[PDB]
Structures are given as structure tokens and as C-alpha cells.
Symmetry: C5
Subunit: 103 residues, 5 copies
């Protein structure tokens, strides 16, 4: 089991760490069919998504996808500093796998 986001991210293929050390600039959420997703942006122009749930996700990830969207909404509203994000760079916008928060 990994002890931090960087080591967790290294267990997966096609992932990358982005270091933001910044609060979320914008939070977007959609209930429209086939686009049930969240998008966040940062000041520096980075855009990330939480993926629409789909056949590519195992059952155990479903509750974790809904948790991530909850986390990003409350992070946004509290102006919490996002340290790092682990993302899948094979999606556009890049797709969030993990988040760390520190300040």
C-alpha cells in the first residue's frame, strides 16, 4: 500500500503527477445525460475532469468517483490549497485519479 500520492500514482500506467500548490479557480458540474461529470480549473490554465462513470471503472471505484466530486466542490468552496493531482493523461481534459491537499 502506498504512503503518498506520488507513490500511489506510480503504481498505475499512463498516469502523471501535476503539482499545483494552489486553490481551485473554477468548479463546473453537469447533470446532462452522458456528461455526468465535474471539471475544475486552475489559475495557471490547467483543466481536469472527474470522469463520467463508465464500463472502464470497476464497481469499487463508483463510490470513490462520487466522493471525489464531493471533495472538489468543498475544496473549491473552502479555497483549500490543492498540493498535487494524479491524473490519467490519456484523456482530455486529463482525468483525476487522486488528490492531495496541504497548506
Amino acid at each position: 500500500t502506498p504512503q503518498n500520492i506520488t507513490d500511489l500514482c506510480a503504481e498505475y500506467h499512463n498516469t502523471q503527477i501535476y503539482t499545483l500548490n494552489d486553490k481551485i479557480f473554477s468548479y463546473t458540474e453537469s447533470l446532462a445525460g452522458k456528461r455526468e461529470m465535474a471539471i475544475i480549473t486552475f489559475k495557471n490554465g490547467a483543466i481536469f475532469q472527474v470522469e463520467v462513470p463508465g464500463s472502464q471503472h470497476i464497481d469499487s471505484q463508483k463510490k470513490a468517483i462520487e466522493r471525489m466530486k464531493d471533495t472538489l466542490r468543498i475544496a473549491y468552496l473552502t479555497e483549500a490549497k490543492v498540493e498535487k493531482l494524479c491524473v490519467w493523461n490519456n484523456k482530455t481534459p486529463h482525468a483525476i485519479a487522486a488528490i492531495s491537499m496541504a497548506n
Copy 2:
């Protein structure tokens, strides 16, 4: 996959963008049968609904309808600035599809 709300909204028929750049003036919700819905207003007189779930919605959308109501309530209570709404304009009140917040 769209990268912002405007591009998302363009994926659907019968939608338009509003750019409020304002907090929600009023928040209403109902638990009455066949009217389990939220209504929000803005200082400028605009009125929007989150629709009663129904045939127009597929199964993946039910969780997102609930999340949208959660998002609107906490945005109201935090006085969070709404940047844009994507809404369906063949409903009265216009029906929310997506929201962006930025300040």
C-alpha cells in the same frame, strides 16, 4: 469530452448559456409528491429549476440531479458566485443542466 460549460452545453439540443456572475438570491426545495424539485432565483429576476426526475432523464442522471441540488444549496448558503448556467429552454422555469462557479 468538453473542457468547459459552454462546450458541454453545445452538445445538447434546446439549451442556452446564462452568465450570472452573481450569488443565488433564493433557494426553494419541495418534497411534495410529483414536485420533488429545487428552484433558484437571482437578483436580476431569473428563475431556474432542477427538474423533478422523470422520463427525460436516464439512470446515470439520477445521482447527478441529487448532486446538483446539493451543489445549489451549499452555493446558496456560502454565497458562492455562480459564473454560468447551462439550461434547457423548452421548460418553464428553464431547467438546469450544468453550473460553473468561479470568483
Copy 3:
């Protein structure tokens, strides 16, 4: 579809609007068997319940009842001004059908 709480309330028999324009003075909740309910009061001595969920409530109302209790708790805790309540007046205490908040 109604555009406000007052028009929504009028669609039901045995309802009326209370206009409080005040924060919730007390919040009570119960997990006791057959009394899984909430009760709120206002400084003017008005008392209202969220009903125990039952057979008089269709499935779509079950989620909405739980949301409403969530709403009242967080409204209480943030001292949010309640504008109006739509309530069934054929229950004692009068039972909440809808709420609007504005300040």
C-alpha cells in the same frame, strides 16, 4: 411547473404558506422507532415537522424527505433566513412540504 413555493403549495389540498422571514430557533431530530422525524421551531412559536416516512409517501418523496432534513439541519447551523414554508395543515404539528430561503 410552479416557479415559486406559493404556486407550488396551491397545487395541493390541505396546504398553506407560512411566511417566517426568520432563522430556525430550534432543530430536533429523532432516531427512535416509529419517530424517525425532525421538528423545527421559530422564535414566534411556530412548530413544524418533517413527517416520519410511511405509506402515505410515494417512493420519489423518500429521497426528498431525507434531503429536507439535511436542509433544515444545515439551515439551522448557518442561521439561514427561512422565507416561507409550505405545510400540510391536516397534521399536528403541521408537516413540511416545501421551504424557501432568501435574505
Copy 4:
């Protein structure tokens, strides 16, 4: 249907009302197997539990047990004054049945 916590509490055997009129001093929560519970304390030394779900609880109480633990956590973190608790006094620690908040 009762209109306050004291009358609700008096509908049950083996209960009494504690009047705290004080914030929660400590909040404890456990996920350990067979001890999935919460424990709160007050400055006066009083200690109360939300019980582990089990056969003494009817199906309608399961969501309300979860709601209560959510309520105690947010009350703790907001320093919300707890007015009264209705508790079962045949459990050790005494087990919460209902809570009222007012300040």
C-alpha cells in the same frame, strides 16, 4: 405526533431527558468491526453513544442512526449548543434516541 423532544422521549420506556445546554466537548467515531459507533462527551463528564446498528433497531431506524452520527459530527465541529438529549438509560453508555439544538 410529539411537538418537542421531551414529549417524544416520554413515548418510550427506559428513556430520560438530559438537559446539557452546552456544546459537545469530544466526538469519537469507530469503523472497527462490531464497534461501528460514535461516542460524545460533555464538559460535565456526561458520555453518550450512538449504538452499533443491530437487531434492537427496526429497518426504518438504520438511515436515522446514520443521520444522527452526521448530526453529532457537524454539531461538534460548529460548536453548536445541544439543548437536550433523549437517551436509553438501560445501555452503557446511555444511547441517543433524539437530540435538540437551540441557542
Copy 5:
């Protein structure tokens, strides 16, 4: 039934109490397949996880795992002082079984 976290922790093998008396330094969460987990750290260097749900967890522990992650996230975001953690010391990082908060 135990009345405090120390006595609760003593009911289990492979556990120990850490007395932190400190807010959470970082919060990390992951939706990644098979690492649906949370990691917290403290200023003193200590690292703890909430375990990926698994065969070592009975079905009653599943809601509580979800709650604990909710609790850690809101604690981090309110800078809530964590008094004690009961952790399993046969996992790496040590895995949270219980938390107490007081300040």
C-alpha cells in the same frame, strides 16, 4: 460497550493509540481502481490510511469506512484538532480504526 477510544482500541488485537493533539497536516484521497483509499499525515511525520474496503472488513464496516473518510476530509478542512487515533499496526501505513476529536 466501551466509553472511550482507548478502551475501544484495547478490545482489538494489533492496535495502538496515537495521541496527536494536532490538526491534520495533509489529506489525500484516491478513486484509482483497487486504491480507493485515503491517507492523512501530521506535522510530526505520522502517516495513516483508511483502508481500501476488503475481505478483512465485515459488511457493517463498509458504511463506517465511508463515514471515516468523510470525517477526515471535514476535519482537515476545518483544521479540527485530532486528539487520538486508534490504528491497526499490522498495515503499512497504519490503518485507522477510530478517531477522537477534542480541543
